[PDB]
Symmetry: D3
Subunit: 315 residues, 6 copies
């Protein structure tokens, strides 16, 4: 079964939890252990009900309160947990795009791994938060082959109900072959077109047909025929169709690798997947990497930052 690590607190009362957070912040200092405990043990919908009771009881929004009480990564991870899911991704896209430079990788994690219905919700929430239109913003901040793949992803046009038909999986696998390996350059239109429109079941069957004609896997073929941003965008889709839990277990491992941490990725994957398949992502992490995801966080992170994260994650 695919499930996340956060489950709704049983015998929840938003009034009482709003009043416990007010008490945790009252006076000088803050009781972070209380804040961490409430946020990390209520589901996102319960956190949204705590938030309406806090503003009705107190006249101030819980968000504004935390930004004055908290700092740095604990503030960011806490604040992430109160964002309605769709909005959080909508906001993470914004951050990737409108800074100095681009988090190319944040855009791939969010647009390339998504269903049609999720793309339609991330597009809506961005419009609502930012008044601008995301495809118009993606087209302003990206160019070339990469831009084109993210414009495809924003349409929500995959033929998700297309059935596995092996004669066609074979026609497409051959088509991709001629585009890549079968010629000197690469016709990128054919990579983008097939990986953007075919259902995920039908894409699986293509990948298998491709290994019977070629002596490289489709991953190897993209890895050789493509460079940079579009190479990582197209491999994200291949990894999503083959095994989504491994894609994120990978992206998480890389956040924690070497010196320091890429907390931005860490907060983003842990928080977004927490109520969808963070349980599965954890078993795939362990199997691929030796250590547990818990152990990994426990070593790379510190303070309350580390605690909040380790209570979302669980052992």
């Amino acid at each position: 079964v695919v499930q996340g690590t956060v489950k709704p607190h049983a015998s929840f009362n938003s009034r009482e939890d709003a009043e416990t957070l007010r008490k945790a912040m009252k006076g000088i200092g803050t009781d972070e252990k209380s804040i961490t405990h409430i946020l990390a043990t209520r589901s996102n919908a319960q956190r949204q009900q705590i938030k309406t009771d806090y503003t009705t009881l107190f006249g101030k929004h819980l968000e504004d309160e935390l930004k004055s009480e908290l700092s740095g990564n604990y503030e960011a991870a806490a604040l992430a947990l109160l964002r309605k899911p769709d909005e959080f991704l909508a906001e993470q896209l914004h951050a990737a795009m409108k800074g100095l430079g681009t988090d190319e990788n944040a855009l791939i994690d969010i647009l390339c791994t998504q269903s049609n219905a999720q793309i339609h919700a991330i597009k809506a929430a961005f419009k609502l938060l930012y008044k601008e239109d995301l495809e118009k913003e993606i087209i302003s901040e990206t160019s070339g082959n990469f831009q084109r793949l993210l414009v495809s992803m924003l349409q929500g046009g995959r033929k998700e109900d297309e059935p596995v038909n092996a004669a066609h999986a074979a026609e497409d696998a051959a088509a991709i072959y001629q585009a890549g390996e079968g010629q000197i350059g690469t016709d990128e239109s054919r990579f983008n077109a097939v990986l953007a429109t075919r259902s995920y079941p039908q894409l699986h069957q293509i990948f298998h047909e491709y290994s019977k004609i070629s002596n490289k896997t489709i991953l190897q073929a993209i890895e050789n025929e493509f460079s940079g941003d579009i190479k990582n965008g197209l491999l994200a889709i291949v990894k999503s169709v083959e095994n989504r839990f491994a894609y994120f277990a990978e992206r998480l491992h890389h956040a924690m690798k070497g010196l320091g941490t890429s907390d931005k990725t860490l907060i983003r994957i842990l928080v977004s997947r927490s109520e969808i398949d963070l349980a599965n992502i954890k078993e795939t992490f362990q199997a691929m990497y030796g250590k547990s995801l818990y152990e990994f966080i426990a070593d790379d992170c510190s303070g309350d930052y580390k605690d909040l994260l380790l209570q979302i994650t669980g052992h």
Copy 2:
């Protein structure tokens, strides 16, 4: 029974009414007695149907036609009567905030005396008429304890289905006591939090428990522990819980007291409550004040302004 003073015209024809109003304004002069009569004897829903036939028969809006034929308080009262009810309060709020100064008292009349579903409607009609967000605009034009009470009010978060439970009514009455009378200062958070979230039946029970532990009523305690705008904000909620008809009979009485009139209060309350509980507000007014509301208006107001008001109100 709680009822207003304006009941829908039986055998109403908006085409014929639209035609009458054009005839009452044609030429030099205006036939005010005819405008007064159609506007005051039609319910607001009928006046909205008159409004659509006027613009489709004559290609100009009835409002624009009135602003030319009328002046001063008769124009203001006549135009008040044509506004959709939600829009009229959203518009009164705009006028209280975005002038020279603040009509602190219009903002309390509209936000502190409302149910969750009416707050939600006044908020939406505002965003529609003004493109801005009311909670954002109240936060720009107010400060401190009063701003927080109006931010609580705009959430629509009262637990209106909360049942009378005496043990709790008793625990909150005790908590309000310590926050006020039982200490030198005043913890205002406690006052704001209890009056803003409990249901009105549970609040009634609290006020009763408070008098058994204090020798003062909750109104006296507020009157003493608080000043200015928040003192008035908080007593509007207590007065709405105990007797809403008396709150408004009071506010009307003060509009008409002394020299001149506060027509802005007078038009706003008469017109908003005309199809809700103006009958009951009229009986409480006489009971509290000696004179009838009819008689009060007849003395303080003049011309056609006086007649339009006296026809909405009735004897």
Copy 3:
């Protein structure tokens, strides 16, 4: 039966059609015969499915690809066929109003010949496309009696469910008579008022009553009492009530008259009536004018423009 000239392609595949249009523009040149054929033999809803698949396969919009491959009227007509129908009218309006001058005649064709629900959709699509409000925009770009008829039109307030009542048809016929013929001036309010509010069935009955009291038809009386823009605005309503097909067969004939063509009218009527009643407009054209519609276009137009138009029209 009333029916247009374009019927949905049976065994339609949007993925394959998108692919064929990419193949038709690939390289230097364009294969216009291929574009003409896909556009002219798919219904507008099928063209919208081809659009979503083109953008998901290729990551560029079919519109942007045609603007670069095509030019002049073939670009205009091809692009007109791809617009969602409501949008295409909201766009036409924009073009009439906001240039050097006014295409007075576009505004009448679109606003004066429409049902309540169609007026409400054109109004919506305009607000969506252009963020401004259409009635605010028609009031900025028109004045006087004309402005007033087009504001009436924009209210969607015709009493479409008004039943044929001869006694009343007779009272209004007589009212229009006094306003016009029965007096030196013209009371325009009465011509506007009756033509804007009465159902089309009840209007038919009035035109009949009018010929029994007058020796002139309502057309001749409008033709004489009125000038210019409003004279053409009021005759568009009468012609729509008596015979809509003839209104357009007329408009079309005039587009193709003399030296050159008014392609802007030609593309607009052909394309908006193609799936509603272009077949009926074509019979009425022949009947009124001797030659066929097909024959007329075939003579006044050229290139691929002419072929596209001839395929949408049929023989």
Copy 4:
């Protein structure tokens, strides 16, 4: 000499005056006598320097502080006195137009009595404050002959350097005569045209030429040929050309007449002419009305409101 009643404080220090206001609001209560004293004995440019130092010393704007400490008419007058002069009128216009109704009379006081240069500054300050265009807003909120008079005033196109030429003063006086008195109706275009473009010296000479061809004055001729808003509009210009001080002495007298006060007018004229010609408006008031301006305000107004107003006006 023409001069106002408010002169710059000699040995002014904005830092000290900012600190004195902070001390007058500190704590419970407010020391209104101290706020009245600084605001009323500092010229408007000194008040703006007090405003910058308050916000740099305490990090809150002075305005926000006074809205919390003050109420009603004292809040409104104290806040009027802190507005930059051009912004105060741009705001007074906004208030006259976008409420329930129109203060027809505020609009004429501001737009009909002004020079080209002032109109151009009220226009600019409005667009700044409100992002909208004043002419576009006057055209939305007014109709007909009055709207045209107000659009004329907003152009800033009076030929102010036009010299007195009696042959033409005579030609125009005659033209005005034929437009009005010399015919049954009124050609308003001629009244509008000559009163809006000719210089004020040349206009004076015209009024004189008129009385030699008519037995009525131009005032009487306007008074009879015109009604309502445009009659008051055109009389404002005539009284501004003949005697501007008397125009305001009149409007002030009427603000204070009868029961109550029209404080809105009262604050508006006293505060806007305080540094221009409130000295002269005061002599003309006494001379026309018997009592002093000071004496009038002292009877019609109360509290601290009356004190502020009595310090701006002087004896």
Copy 5:
């Protein structure tokens, strides 16, 4: 000498002219002969003074009055002549871009034949009229090589003070040769780079160096190496450097060729060059075409449209 065909009316009075136009439109009908006369015999700056007096005398804008009195091409030409010159061109770009399709040719006439300082003004007038940014809009409505040449044009970065240096003219001519003729493809960056940055004196020198190394002129080389929009974009710059008057005499000739007229071009070139170099364009027309520009218009055009146009042009 380079000069236009409209010269400022000597003994011009804007008040008297504004009055003459009101008289021309008063009543039923319009006196087009009078409007044609004032418009065509006043310079553009005088027309802007007539425009302010008309609005200050009558309270309505001249433009709005002409849209109600006029129709079709006379309305368009008479309104073109009242537009401030910069605005006219910003408005023409808007009309080329934001309709159904693109007038690719309007964009090249305006952007590819301009100085740095004129581009800078057309950019400014667009942002002013439209609130949007012209480069942003040109990037939305165009793609590819063409887009890139128009984004170059909009920078205003031509090195206008660069001096004729034959060694470099020779070096660039050589560079263009290799880009084009000297290879199978075309490196377009090299054509775009040299024709967009070098001064017009230097460019002339290059064209001359080019003919000594090639056997084709740079025109023939562009004509062969390029296609469509970019081919005409690049040839507009070469024809502006060699002879601007011939570029427009050609554009004008094609507006009038065949059946009908392209009035849109005809009004646009005649009105924009009328005070710059229409007299030169007229001598080049005759020289190149046989007939006079006057005689051409006289045959292709009609009504008052034809007259207005023949007055602007002269014999």
Copy 6:
């Protein structure tokens, strides 16, 4: 002397540098060594000249070209170097406030260390880039004492021309003493008010008077009477007045401390002070820290990022 580490390239040609950057990116790969070289050895105004020529030569902006060729921290440091100086800071503010959380420290680095003139430019560049108002944005994203210190900073109201007057330096040092050390609480208004308004020379004199009355330095008293955000806000002003170069040397040292780097601080301070006083900040770094700033970067950083940063810094 106070000077930065980047000096204008002598014999600079923007056309040739723009061509060099095109060649460095052409094809697959990028020649980062060339890009680093031009960006790091041209002053910012020279970089703006390169930018205009790149877009006029190639029709695409240099920023868009780098985002596609670069990645990570080299992208951000390269793009940082191309921003107009005022825009860069206005962009840094935006990134500090509008993400998940607040970079409290970037806001103090920027707003608390600036002159009046600099604050006024950051305010303008923000409004321009972001259409919003910075003060309004700081007031949205910050609360309490901190917000008030940053609102004071945004006023540009420091009396920079205030002269050192020992009697007053002593009066204020004693006021700060009673506000802090001389009482249990802290009156923060007094710390805010003296630090925000007095000139930097007068402030130095105050700090000296304070140590004669107290036994602790003003830094120790702030360190003890204050907490968090406002403690760091007030200490940045005290460090700015005493020694600006040490404030930054301190901030840089902390960016590079421990595991990882805070690149965002590193790029921000290196880039902003490069042409102002990076030479002095480097001497103060060595003196305070043992190692050179060069040596520090060279250890904490890698790749091309490290090279770019080491070339802007110098040895």
